[PDB]
Each structure stands twice: as C-alpha cells, then as structure tokens.
Amino acid sequence: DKWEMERTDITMKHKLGGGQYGEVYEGVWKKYSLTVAVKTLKEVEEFLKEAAVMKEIKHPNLVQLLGVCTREPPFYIIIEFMTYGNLLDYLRECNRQEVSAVVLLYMATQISSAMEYLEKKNFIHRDLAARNCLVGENHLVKVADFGLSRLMTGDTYTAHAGAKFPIKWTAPESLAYNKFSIKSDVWAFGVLLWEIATYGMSPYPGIDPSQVYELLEKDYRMERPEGCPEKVYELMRACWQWNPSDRPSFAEIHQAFETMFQESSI
Ligand SMILES: CCn1nccc1-c1c[nH]c2ncc(-c3ccc(N)c(C(=O)N(C)C)c3)cc12
C-alpha cells in the first residue's frame, strides 16, 4: 500500500524515553530532514497487527503513523516524533505559571477528544496514563497508540491468564475479572485527570498497589487535588463509578471539558 517504505529511508538513532516504551527509537527521515520515532522488533504477528490498526486511525490528538516496513525483517513502524516527551515528565518538570489551570483544561480537552474518536470508531486503548500521553509544541497533547485494539463500543475483552496490569490505573472489573471495555478506559481517564490536576503525582500515594482493590470495594476514592475545581473532580468521581455502565461516555466527558475550556478562555 501507500504506507510501505524502504528501511534505508530512515537513519536510526538512540532509544527514546530511556527505553521505557521498549524498542522505540529516535530516527531521521532523510528525504524530509525530519526527526521521527521508530518502533522495531528485536511476537511478530502481534507487532504486524499494530501496524495494521494504526493505518486506520487519523485524529489530531492521536500519534500519526507515517509509514511501515513490513515486507521483510527487521520491521519498522514509523511515527511522528513528539519533542517534549511524555505528559508525566512534562507536568512534573514544567513552569506552572506557563502550564496554568487553563492549559490543564486544554490538555484534558485534547485527550478526551482522542478518546471520543476511539469510542465512535470502535477502538479501545487499555493503557491510558500520563506516561502514555505525549507532548508537542504549544501544549499539544497526543495519546500514544501502538497497542490500540478493535472492539465494538459496548463489547468486552477478557485478558490472558496471568496478565499483569498497572493496578492504580486499572478498573475494578479488570482487576477482578480481567474484563476490559471502553468503560475501563473511562476509569483510566479519571486517574489520568488526577495525574494532570496534581502535575504528575503518583496515584494513591503511599498505598501499595496490592491494597488498592480492597479500598475501591469499600468505596474509597482519591481525594480532590489542591486547586482542582469541584466540577472537574465531579467528572473524576463519575469516571470512578463502580458499575461500568454508570460511568459517562467520552462524548459526554469531551463536551464537558470543551465547555469548561471555552468558558475559562472567555
Ligand atoms: C505510538 C506512540 N508511542 N508509544 C510509545 C512511544 C511512542 C512515541 C511516538 N512518538 C514519540 N515521540 C517521542 C516519544 C518520547 C517520549 C518520552 C521521552 N522522554 C522521549 C525522549 O527521549 N525525548 C528526546 C523527548 C521521547 C515517544 C513517542
């Protein structure tokens, strides 16, 4: 297809993100003198399905695919490079006078827009967190999208036996029954909002992941962050409803943040 390109078009550089994303490298697309990111493979079929799914997604707030090398090993997935790294590091290291409350709303609006798109297009993310959001110039935020999966909105995924989850971002039904859906993404988005409001604090601070589920069962939820508007905290708490069906849609979340962002600018 039009996505296929030569490996020789790319000059490979160093591993990006301190190697936290696995085999993702900085690279140069020589034709365009352009810094790109490249995912390589050091299981093959799973990797090739990733490349296939990314061909289908197009949204200003999801990392854009640029090309693939899928004819012969080693395989490449070539994607745009996000200059300011991940949102977690960005928020932790930022000038808070620049990255103010209205900017926090802007970033939340961008992420919910990408998620509304996936919701509409029958996709599920399954690993939403600040570490998996990426930052460009002028507070542009794009959701990392290697592992996106096809799943009709409403339908459920059951994880493989012995699967390990990032517990503090993981919905109760996922933790107990390995069940994932667009509503578990909504839960994770709530934890992401908490990350944003606190400028990259670790969720449930001081609480060992092994004790999180039992807290959630007894109706414990994280406290409202300092300086966080109650209307935003209300959305967080709605995302953390025990029953997946009680949680709002990403369409509703995005509408809420759009309204709030527009009012904050005015
Ligand atoms: C498909 C989306 N995705 N999934 C995993 C990785 C990416 C990704 C795509 N494009 C990227 N562009 C940049 C980065 C990234 C993240 C954190 C970092 N500390 C750095 C970094 O070292 N510098 C030079 C800023 C780079 C990650 C990605």
Architecture of domain 82-266: Orthogonal Bundle (1.10)
SS (H, E, C) 202-237: CCCCCCCHHHHHHHHHCCCCCCCCCCCCHHHHHHHH
Q: Does the annotation list 18 as a binding residue?
A: yes
Q: Cα–Cα distance between 60 and 27 in angstroms, integer? A: 22
20, two tokens:
């936290």
Resolution to 1 decimal place, in Å: 2.0
- In the block, which residue shows the tokens 């790319």? 10
CA 222 – CA 229 distance, rounded (Å): 15
In single-letter form, the type of residue at position 14 comes to H
The CA distance from 188 to 125, in Å, is: 10
Residue whose Cα lies nearest atom 14 of ligand 1: it is: 85
Which letter, b or e, does each residue of 114-127 get, where b requires 16 or more Cβ atoms within 10 Å of its Cβ?
Answer: bbbbbbeeebbbbb
Cα–Cα distance for residue pair 14/23, rounded to 1 Å = 10
Q: Is 162 annotated as a binding residue?
A: no
Q: Which residues are catalytic?
A: 127
Longest dimension (CA), the chain: 58
Q: What residues contact 135, with CB distance under 8 A and at least 6 apart?
A: 82, 83, 84, 85, 86, 87, 90, 141
- Three-state SS string over 116-136 comes to HHHHHCCEECCCCCHHHEEEC
Atom of ligand 1 nearest to the CA of 22: 5
Q: Using CA atoms, how far apart are residues 101 and 97, in angstroms rounded to an integer?
A: 9
Residues of the chain with CATH 1.10.510.10: 82-266
CA 65 to each of CA 17, 225, 231, 235: distance values in angstroms, whole numbers, following the listed order: 18, 35, 35, 31
DSSP assignment of 64-110 equals PEEEEE-SSSSPEEEEE--TT-BHHHHHHHS-TTTS-HHHHHHHHHH
What number does CATH give the domain 1-81?
A: 3.30.200.20
What is the Å distance from ligand 1's center to 135 Cα? 9
Where in the chain is CATH 3.30.200.20? 1-81
Q: What does the chain come to in residues? A: 266
Task: Map residue 19 onto helix, strand or coil.
Answer: helix
* CA dist., res. 166 & res. 254, Å (int): 25
Give the Å distance between the CA of 134 and the centre of ligand 1: 7
Counting Cβ atoms within 10 Å, is residue 206 exposed (0-12), middle (13-18) or buried (19+)?
exposed
Closest CA to 111 of 50, 52, 190: 190
